């Protein structure tokens, strides 16, 4: 019976559900897992890079990207939708800086990206299907470090610690167990890397992960091979 | 530009190109085959024993006596007694693959206690019969709440004024889930069989598996009852991540596996699979370890089995 | 049909007559040959000629003789036939209109010919399974080959596939000579010109041309035949029903 | 069923509507072209020769696209007319912009881009016409190209499209000399292959039209051979055939 | 157009045996029964004597042999193939002449149209003016007729009247006369019958013209 | 009663016509003469039971025992559908009669007088393997993996049945070889029958279905019964898609009987104890999921078309016996990216040899191979992809 | 019925028709690309043509600019359209900003084009895969690969088309810094990797070479013959 109520994004099922939106939410899973953690010292993003074969130089699997000098976006889903939404986020941050001569709040930028993702089939904007990608915006603003999760349905919500991607269900419980409100950035990094090792196919070693941090201070930083090895030494 | 072979051409083809021992080789090979056939012919049948009992156990006296007078009888299931007409019962018989007849039987104790609807031995010529022939999630939580509680203390239902009913449909690991719920009435996936099941049941939660012989079975069953059907109101489907991990652990306990196995990771890698599929994955991991010639199966072997059994750059 | 005749003669005669050649070559003997082509090209006629000029036991299955109503009888009949061929080896099994017994299989449902499909599977097994056939050659014939099950077309079950294209006007002249040899012709007659007047005509059409020319001769209580009668017979036999709206015809420039 | 639209990919990755158009080109009247160092030529059969039709147009399949270029169409009549007019427009647009005739490769590229756009965009059926272009330009002298319904073009020494294209191309491969063919030999070969491919009694001079493009005095000339010249060529070919038959006898 | 009647003619002018069968008779519910019936018919005709098998209505079985992607149509195709194979196969027949009639010769299989199996392909067109005159004479015979009748008008009036409907014209003119209490039919009686047989359909949505 | 195996003579290693092979064959023939002479010589060298026979019916019949009763009475099927409440003589073994056994009955009185344990349906007896195909694993080019899995499924569980026990893993008792039309599916079964010590049993799905009443299910019963009586055994069912297609509600009686036989087969696939089953199939989707359920068909071996290396190996295997010419080069034929089965390669080699013979030359050549490849294969538009 | 629509999702979350476009790509002649220290090379299989067919009208290697080349695998018409638009945008970017296009920029633009064509419902995806090899304005042997789904990655050496998997595995095994130390070992590696699919080695091979601050050069058939002779000599010597 679920074959006539999901031919279009603008068709309601008897349960009053947007099955196409639900289907895109399901599509979210295919991507590699990402974990973001908020702490009073900042926010940390760690993503399981999923190199399908070596000889692929790592600077093309962009699961963590930079939004302005104060936010980082972790992606899970279609690379095309990832690129489109990342471009929108960057353009919106720069436009807000140009207009109001300030730095957009993480909540505001996530809201703008969600506003772009809202337009499903509205004949007034031209995408026609949900953006099969889930994003984690971790940044620093006047309200202290913050982290937000946005899903294809345009819904965004604050999250002091969240995980998305293929290892979403298995990592959410680990985050719940290991999370106490007060940590340090190093503690969050260690916990996130431990969870990644728990829910990663490969042995966690130097490459195959990416780690980024935004702190009330130095701008968004991508940990290089040296720091990655240093942390992996005593995860 | 195509020619036809000549007799001299083919003779030259046969002789010219050949090692000097070709003819002898063919002769010896034909000899081999013919002699093998001759040996097969001359085998000599090994006398097929008739099943005769060891000597000194035969009597031949009871044998002669039974041969002289044992009156072999044919087997047939009675269908009706035509109400027995009080006297002159006039039973009806359905000699299988042969015919249906009517009979008075006689020589037995009581026209009614003889038989009603079950096997009987009809005499050869006069069809008078002589002898009465003898013959895990809410998917389990709900079933628990509807069976086990009205197993040790069903009287609570009557205490509260509710009638505790029977009859639950296990539509959907159905078999072993039902067995665990029992932890017994085994059933096979006709009217005589269900009648027999009625007799066994009524001298004591009947686990029907796969649920006009069959129509008569349904009629008698419905009349008797007013039970666990196993079609394939509680529903059964695949388990979630934690259920798959639990099944993996349950089935990998009995293996020479390595110390630590990421069963959570394997459950994540194995979606939409069944319990039988999980069993197959574990067994394939075992054969993979054996192929590798290593006594201890590892996570690598388990992952290889997952890939082989259950089963790209646009999603990272 | 010189090339086809000699190819089929290879496949059947050469293995049955002189297996030593294949033994020396070190190649397994050919087993089956499938004759396919448009109607009236000479498939069944060549089968008859082989049966007449072959000294091997010639068995013939024609049409859907193996499609028996009783359950599990076609397979039994096929097995018995192959047993009989083995008994009277060397054997040549002609099999006309295989697409009757055996075509592209279907998803077995309420609307599937499961019995015929399984009989065809039995035929497959007999042609190539365990205990491969010793001296049982098979000459299957069909009109449309594309629908035949790929299992049948598998080389080993059909070691050769002979096409029977319509004559190239030279085969047409030869067929006219063959079928008019017993015809009281008249001087000043050009069977060659008749052949050219017949384009793309099958051998059956040529035989019909001869028959209709004879019929026209009979019409005038005659024993003659002439270019007029032959031309009229060609026109009558090749009565092509074309399309005359000219718009459906000129849609394609 | 992966063939209800021109913009649908079958699970194997096949454009079934495009393939249907390519196959359906097989119904078009036979056309063929041969390249020679002296010049280039096309021959084409008239599918319908009913005696109640006029010869108002001195060409039915061969059109002149510009001063230095001609093309033969094979396919649906409406699409053929549309593409012919559009080719004329493209060539004259290039002439207006650059003040020099468009190279044949460039014209083929433009029209094939348009064909591909039709195969790719929305609810438009692919242009179901194949084309054979002949032209001259200062960059590659004489050229002959062949364009398919799917917007794919290739440069050929000699080729054939339409009815009996397989037989015609087989004969062209067998008989065509790679680099020592003159215009007369090309015409003889064209008549021979047309005779062996039409399979309609004798090759009547009225059931065929031939065009020849050659450079003369620095100016290209495309001549549509008259009935007299076609009659002469067919008569010469049948004389050669009779000589061969007599010698074989 | 009077083809079944021509078959009835043979059978009242043939010294040979006759076997009339219906194209739909060969079909059967059980697998293989259709082919068995075809083989039985042909073998019986071959063995008895010079015989004529009149398979009327052949289009019930012989239609173009498409893939058929099912069971029943494949059984029909097997009936057709058995018919082809018996008419011209390995075991050639002799003196088993066959006649078959159909209302639509286009759909028939191209293999059961091959000189050697169907080498005549006779057409039975709708009557021309001359055939209309002959039919009218033959029918109006054995019939009392008025002196004022002009069959020429009816014959000349261009229509699509077939032999069966010409017979119907004469028959209903006869019944109209009987009801009118008269054994000699008048021109009014025919005119009525001719109108009631032509049955010219009207009300055609006129924009089509 | 143990396995039955298949008698097979040793294999002469040299495939060339040489004195090694000649002497090996001569020794084989010497030993065959010895066997024949020993037989001849031995068979030349060589009351109470009489009354037992006299009491036993002269033309005694064979029936089936059912629901043994008492110690002297039992129900027996006459083998025509009917059954009788017969008696048992003291002659029979007793403590040996079980339901389904093929007992012997006095013709007239119909009294049990024998047991006839070796009663085998002629169909089962004939489908049992006696000879052994001379296709060892060496003849199979490529399919190295498939050979590995088949050995692990039907060979290791017999030669080294300790690895499975060490880790408490039950062996797979069912292997379905599914693939396109001709890739070695039957070759692997041939090689297994050749090289195995187990009782092989050839069958084809189109053979188990008989017409009279329930003889289909009865024959399946007999087949698996003998496969159990002998052990280890390997039952090779070729083209199982004859019976096993998607089970559907029957509209007739024959279809109901077919589904009944298939169900009887599935039932007999729950009689573990060591009787391996090897299904073969050209199209596996049509098979019912119940059969392919992962509890009765444990392994599914796909037989894909051969790659370049596999095609090369096949070509050397099938040309080893051919007097190849030095000019030949066996790469162009292979790597031409076109479908080519192992059967297709054998056909190519045979047609090439025939072409050389037609040309009157006993040595094949490159042009002969090219012509063979052109004329053997029978069956995307140009330019559309580059 | 979860198919035959570019803008419809399936339970697994797939875009089946763009996946089908990738499958269509998989049916094209093999094209390998490699990057060296100062040389970037593209090899492509030819598949040969009938003698009656001219060759200059068949192209699998096309220069998108002075410092960027493009190898192709997929549908030829889509190839022509994509290459034309890529050249147009290269020149347009040169106009907009007075700096030659970077390989990353141009490959991103091509990926965006494919993404735009696969977003909507009335458009068919460009069923092609492309390899962009070039030298950035600072000097670097960059190589990217773009798929029909609008996704582009950066590689060091990759093969697309029919023999993609086998040739990629061979490059995986036999790609090393010493194997690309100089500007001839890279070419030798390219012919070695293509020989597992092509037959003649010289008659079914086309090579294009880009050297820093030097225009593209297509290797002559005689040069290819000499190179394949060198590889054959090396193989026999190592034997
Ligand atoms: N919740 C569970 N707890 C324990 N074992 C389970 C569970 N779910 C599945 N299994 C495993 O599944 C198998 C039992 O399943 P069972 O044989 O009943 O099949 P099923 O899934 O009901 O299939 P079907 O009815 O379609 O044949 C055993 O391997 C058992 O270990
Ligand atoms: N090459 C030929 N030489 C002579 N006569 C021929 C030839 N081909 C066909 N014929 C004539 O055609 C008649 C029918 O031929 P045949 O039945 O073998 O044709 P077919 O190709 O098998 O056709 P069908 O499709 O009807 O089975 C032959 O009896 C013979 O009269
Ligand atoms: N030529 C004719 N001469 C005289 N009466 C004719 C003629 N044709 C048809 N009829 C009349 O029409 C009746 C039906 O003719 P007949 O059954 O032979 O036609 P048909 O074309 O075979 O019809 P059908 O297609 O319905 O089988 C004949 O009994 C006769 O009454
Ligand atoms: N791998 C192989 N090695 C050697 N010969 C092979 C191979 N594969 C196929 N053959 C040849 O093909 C035949 C073996 O194929 P086989 O009968 O096993 O195929 P199959 O899968 O059962 O076919 P089908 O589906 O058509 O019944 C023999 O001729 C053998 O020579």
């Amino acid at each position: 019976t679920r074959s006539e109520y999901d031919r279009g994004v603008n068709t309601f099922s008897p349960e009053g559900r947007l099955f196409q939106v639900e289907y895109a939410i399901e599509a979210i899973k295919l991507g590699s897992t990402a974990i973001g953690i908020q702490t009073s010292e900042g926010v940390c993003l760690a993503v399981e890079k999923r190199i399908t074969s070596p000889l692929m130089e790592p600077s093309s699997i962009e699961k963590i990207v930079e939004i302005d000098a104060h936010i980082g976006c972790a992606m899970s889903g279609l690379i095309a939708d990832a690129k489109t939404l990342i471009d929108k986020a960057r353009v919106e941050t720069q436009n807000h800086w140009f207009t109001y001569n300030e730095t957009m709040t993480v909540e505001s930028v996530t809201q703008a990206v969600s506003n772009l993702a809202l337009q499903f089939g509205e004949e007034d904007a031209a995408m026609s299907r949900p953006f099969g990608v889930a994003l984690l915006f971790g940044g620093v603003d006047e309200k202290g470090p913050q982290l937000f999760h946005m899903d294809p349905s345009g819904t965004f919500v604050q999250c002091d610690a969240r995980a998305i991607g293929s290892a979403s269900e298995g990592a959410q419980s680990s985050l719940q167990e290991v999370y106490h409100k007060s940590m340090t950035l190093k503690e969050a990094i260690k916990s996130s890397l431990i969870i990644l090792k728990q829910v990663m196919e490969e042995k966690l070693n130097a490459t195959n992960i990416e780690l980024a941090t935004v702190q009330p201070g130095q701008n968004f930083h991508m940990f290089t091979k040296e720091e990655l090895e240093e942390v992996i030494k005593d995860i | 530009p195509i020619r036809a072979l000549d007799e001299g051409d083919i003779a030259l083809l046969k002789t010219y190109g050949q090692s000097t021992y070709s003819r002898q080789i063919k002769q010896v090979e034909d000899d081999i085959q013919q002699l093998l056939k001759k040996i097969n012919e001359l085998t000599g049948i090994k006398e097929s024993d008739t099943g005769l009992a060891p000597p000194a156990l035969w009597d031949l006296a009871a044998d002669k006596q039974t041969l002289q007078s044992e009156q072999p009888l044919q087997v047939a299931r009675c269908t009706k007694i035509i109400n027995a007409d009080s006297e002159d019962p006039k039973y009806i018989i359905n000699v299988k693959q042969f015919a249906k007849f009517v009979v008075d039987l006689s020589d037995q104790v009581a026209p009614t206690d003889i038989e009603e609807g079950m096997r009987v031995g009809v005499d050869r010529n006069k069809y008078q019969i002589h002898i009465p022939l003898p013959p895990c999630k809410e998917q389990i939580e709900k079933l628990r709440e509807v069976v086990e509680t009205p197993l040790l203390h069903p009287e609570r239902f009557v205490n509260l004024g509710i009638e505790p009913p029977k009859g639950v449909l296990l539509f959907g690991g159905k078999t072993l889930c039902a067995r665990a719920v029992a932890n017994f009435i085994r059933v096979i996936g006709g009217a005589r069989m269900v009648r027999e099941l009625f007799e066994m049941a009524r001298t004591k939660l009947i686990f029907f598996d796969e649920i006009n012989e069959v129509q008569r079975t349904m009629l008698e069953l419905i009349n008797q009852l007013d039970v666990l059907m196993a079609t394939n109101k509680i529903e059964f489907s695949l388990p979630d991540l934690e259920g798959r991990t639990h099944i993996f652990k349950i089935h990998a306990r009995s293996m020479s596996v390595e110390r630590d196995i990421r069963f959570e990771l394997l459950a994540r890698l194995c979606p939409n699979s069944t319990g039988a599929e999980i069993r197959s994955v574990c067994t394939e991991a075992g054969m993979f370890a054996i192929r590798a010639r290593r006594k201890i199966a590892t996570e690598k072997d388990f992952l290889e089995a997952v890939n082989k059994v259950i089963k790209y750059m646009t999603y990272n | 049909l010189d090339k086809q005749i000699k190819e089929i003669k290879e496949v059947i005669e050469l293995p049955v007559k002189h297996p030593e050649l294949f033994e020396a070559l070190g190649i397994a003997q050919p087993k089956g040959v499938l004759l396919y082509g448009p109607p009236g090209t000479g498939k069944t006629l060549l089968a008859r000629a082989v049966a007449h000029h072959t000294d091997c036991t010639f068995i013939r299955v024609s049409g859907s003789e193996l499609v028996q109503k009783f359950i599990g009888e076609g397979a039994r009949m096929v097995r018995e036939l192959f047993v009989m061929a083995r008994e009277h080896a060397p054997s040549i099994i002609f099999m006309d209109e295989i697409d009757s017994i055996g075509s592209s299989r279907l998803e077995g449902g309420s609307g599937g010919d499961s019995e015929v499909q399984r009989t065809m599977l039995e035929l497959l097994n007999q042609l190539d399974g365990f205990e491969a056939t010793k001296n049982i050659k098979v000459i299957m014939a069909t009109n449309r080959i594309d629908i035949l099950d790929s299992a049948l077309l598998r080389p080993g079950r059909i070691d050769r596939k002979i096409e029977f294209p319509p004559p190239n006007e030279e085969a047409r002249l030869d067929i006219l000579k063959i079928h008019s040899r017993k015809m009281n012709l008249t001087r000043g007659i050009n069977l060659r010109k008749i052949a050219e007047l017949m384009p793309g005509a099958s051998g059956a059409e040529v035989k019909g041309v001869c028959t209709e020319a004879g019929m026209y001769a009979l019409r005038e209580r005659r024993v003659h035949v002439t270019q007029e009668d032959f031309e009229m017979a060609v026109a009558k036999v090749m009565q092509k029903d074309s399309e005359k709206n000219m718009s459906i015809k000129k849609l394609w420039k | 069923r992966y063939d209800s639209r021109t913009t649908i990919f079958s699970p194997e990755g096949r454009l079934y509507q495009v393939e249907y158009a390519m196959e359906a080109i097989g119904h078009a009247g036979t056309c063929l072209g041969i390249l020679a160092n002296d010049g280039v030529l096309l021959a084409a059969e008239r599918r319908n020769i009913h005696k109640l039709l006029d010869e108002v147009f001195f060409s039915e399949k061969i059109y002149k696209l510009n001063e230095d270029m001609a093309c033969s169409v094979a396919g649906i009549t409406s699409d053929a007319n549309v593409l012919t007019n559009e080719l004329r427009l493209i060539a004259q647009r290039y002439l207006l912009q650059y003040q020099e005739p468009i190279p044949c490769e460039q014209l083929v590229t433009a029209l094939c881009d348009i064909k591909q756009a039709y195969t790719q965009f929305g609810g438009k059926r692919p242009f179901g016409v194949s084309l054979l272009y002949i032209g001259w330009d200062k960059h590659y002298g004489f050229q002959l190209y062949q364009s398919d319904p799917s917007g794919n073009y290739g440069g050929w020494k000699a080729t054939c499209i339409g009815n009996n294209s397989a037989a015609a191309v087989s004969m062209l491969k067998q008989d065509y000399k790679e680099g020592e063919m003159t215009l007369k030999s090309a015409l003889a070969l064209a008549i021979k292959v047309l005779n062996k491919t039409m399979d309609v009694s004798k090759l009547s001079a009225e059931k065929v039209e031939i065009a020849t493009l050659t450079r003369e005095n620095g100016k290209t000339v495309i001549r549509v051979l008259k009935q007299k010249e076609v009659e002469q060529l067919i008569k010469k070919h049948e004389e050669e055939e009779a000589k061969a038959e007599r010698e074989k006898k | 157009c009077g083809k079944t009647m021509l078959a009835k003619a043979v059978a009242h002018h043939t010294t040979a045996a006759f076997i009339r069968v219906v194209g739909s008779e060969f079909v059967q519910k059980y697998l293989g029964e259709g082919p068995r019936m075809v083989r039985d018919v042909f073998r019986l005709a071959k063995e008895n004597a010079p015989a004529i098998i009149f398979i009327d209505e052949i289009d019930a079985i012989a239609t173009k042999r498409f893939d058929a992607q099912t069971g029943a149509d494949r059984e029909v195709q097997r009936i057709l193939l058995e018919l082809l194979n018996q008419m011209d196969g390995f075991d050639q027949n002799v003196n088993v002449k066959v006649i078959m009639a159909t209302n639509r010769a286009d759909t028939l299989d191209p293999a059961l149209l091959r000189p050697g199996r169907l080498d005549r392909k006779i057409e039975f067109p709708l009557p021309d003016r001359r055939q209309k005159r002959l039919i009218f004479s033959t029918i109006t015979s054995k019939m009392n007729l008025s002196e004022e009748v002009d069959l020429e008008d009816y014959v000349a009036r261009p229509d699509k009247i077939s032999g069966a409907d010409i017979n119907s014209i004469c028959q209903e003119s006869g019944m109209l006369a009987v009801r009118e209490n008269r054994y000699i039919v008048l021109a009014k009686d025919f005119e009525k019958a001719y109108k009631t047989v032509i049955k010219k359909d009207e009300q055609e949505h006129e924009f089509y013209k | 009663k143990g396995p039955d195996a298949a008698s097979k003579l040793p294999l002469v290693t040299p495939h060339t016509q040489c004195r090694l092979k000649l002497l090996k064959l001569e020794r084989i023939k010497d030993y065959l003469l010895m066997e024949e002479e020993f037989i001849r010589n031995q068979e030349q060298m060589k009351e109470e039971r009489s009354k037992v026979d006299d009491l036993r019916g002269t033309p005694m019949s064979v029936g089936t025992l059912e629901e043994i009763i008492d110690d002297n009475h039992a129900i027996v099927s006459t083998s025509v559908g009917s059954e009788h409440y017969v008696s048992i003589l003291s002659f029979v073994d007793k403590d040996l009669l079980e339901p389904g056994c093929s007992v012997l009955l006095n013709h007239k009185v119909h009294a049990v007088i024998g047991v006839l344990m070796d009663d085998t349906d002629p169909l089962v007896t004939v489908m049992k393997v006696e000879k052994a195909p001379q296709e060892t694993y060496a003849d199979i080019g490529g399919l190295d993996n498939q050979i590995q899995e088949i050995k692990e499924s039907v060979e290791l569980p017999l030669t080294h049945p300790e690895y499975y026990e060490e880790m408490g893993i039950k062996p797979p008792k069912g292997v379905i070889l599914y693939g396109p039309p001709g890739t070695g599916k039957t070759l692997l079964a041939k090689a297994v029958a050749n090289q195995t010590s187990a009782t092989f049993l050839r069958v084809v799905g189109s053979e188990l279905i008989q017409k009279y009443l329930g003889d289909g299910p009865k024959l399946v019963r007999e087949l698996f019964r003998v496969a159990e009586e002998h052990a280890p055994s390997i039952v090779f069912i070729d083209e199982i898609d004859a019976i096993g297609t998607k089970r559907y509600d029957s509209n007739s009686g024959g279809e109901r009987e077919i589904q009944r036989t298939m169900l009887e087969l599935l039932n007999q696939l729950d009689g573990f104890d060591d009787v391996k089953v090897i299904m073969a199939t050209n199209r596996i989707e049509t098979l019912d999921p119940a059969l392919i359920r992962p509890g009765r068909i444990d392994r599914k071996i796909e037989f894909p078309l051969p790659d370049e290396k596999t095609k090369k190996r096949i070509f050397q295997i099938h040309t080893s016996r051919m007097t190849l010419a030095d000019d030949v080069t066996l790469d162009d034929l292979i790597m031409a990216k076109d479908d080519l089965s192992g059967a297709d390669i054998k056909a190519i080699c045979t047609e090439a040899g025939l072409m050389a013979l037609r040309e009157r030359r006993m040595k094949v050549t490159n042009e002969d191979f090219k012509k063979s490849k052109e004329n053997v294969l029978y069956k995307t538009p140009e330019g559309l992809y580059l | 019925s979860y198919d035959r629509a570019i803008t419809v999702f399936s339970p697994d979350g797939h875009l089946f028709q763009v996946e089908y476009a990738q499958e269509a790509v998989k049916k094209g002649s093999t094209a390998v690309g490699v990057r060296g220290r100062d040389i970037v090379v593209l090899g492509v299989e030819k598949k040969s043509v009938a003698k009656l067919q001219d060759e200059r009208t068949v192209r699998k290697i096309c220069a998108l600019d002075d410092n960027v080349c493009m190898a192709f695998a997929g549908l030829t018409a889509d190839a022509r359209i994509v290459i034309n638009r890529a050249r147009v945008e290269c020149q347009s970017h040169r106009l907009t900003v007075e700096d030659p296009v970077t390989v990353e920029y141009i490959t991103r633009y091509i990926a965006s084009l494919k993404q735009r064509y696969t977003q909507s419902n009335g458009r068919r995806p460009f069923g092609i895969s492309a390899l962009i090899v070039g030298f950035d304005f600072d000097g670097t042997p960059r190589l990217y690969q773009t798929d029909p789904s609008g996704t582009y990655h950066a590689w060091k050496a990759n093969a697309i088309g029919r023999g993609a998997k086998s040739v990629r595995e061979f490059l995986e095994k036999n790609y090393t810094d010493e194997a690309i130390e100089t500007d001839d070992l890279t070419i030798k590696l390219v012919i070695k990797a293509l020989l597992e699919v092509v037959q003649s080695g010289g008659k079914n091979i086309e090579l294009a070479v880009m050297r820093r601050d030097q225009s593209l050069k297509i290797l002559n058939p005689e040069e290819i013959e000499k190179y394949v002779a060198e590889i054959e000599k090396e193989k026999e010597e190592n034997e």
Side-chain angles (χ1 to χ4, degrees), chain E residues 1-6 56 103 131 135 138-139 163-165 167:
Chain E
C1 276
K3 65 197 74 149
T4 296
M5 192 212 302
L6 182 49
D56 188 358
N103 300 332
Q131 199 142 313
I135 301 275
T138 292
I139 290 276
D165 65 41
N167 188 179

Side-chain angles (χ1 to χ4, degrees), chain B residues 136 173-177 232 239 246-247 250-251 274-276 279, chain F residues 293:
Chain B
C136 198
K174 274 67 70 174
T175 76
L176 188 153
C177 83
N232 203 357
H246 197 271
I247 301 149
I250 284 294
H251 276 274
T274 70
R279 185 143 76 193
Chain F
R293 185 189 74 70

Side-chain angles (χ1 to χ4, degrees), chain C residues 173-189:
Chain C
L173 172 51
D174 295 297
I175 296 152
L176 293 174
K177 288 186 181 177
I178 287 157
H179 276 301
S180 79
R181 76 198 183 291
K182 185 152 44 52
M183 182 146 298
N184 287 269
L185 274 289
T186 297
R187 68 209 309 154
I189 192 66

Side-chain angles (χ1 to χ4, degrees), chain C residues 128-129 151 154-157, chain F residues 139-143 179-188 190 238-239 281-282 310 314 317-318 341-344 346:
Chain C
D128 177 5
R154 196 275 301 277
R157 284 202 187 77
Chain F
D139 211 330
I140 303 164
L143 321 173
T183 48
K185 300 188 289 300
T186 307
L187 261 176
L188 194 66
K190 278 190 214 170
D238 203 350
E239 301 96 40
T281 289
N282 211 10
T310 296
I314 297 297
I317 280 176
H318 270 290
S341 295
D344 303 318
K346 184 178 76 175

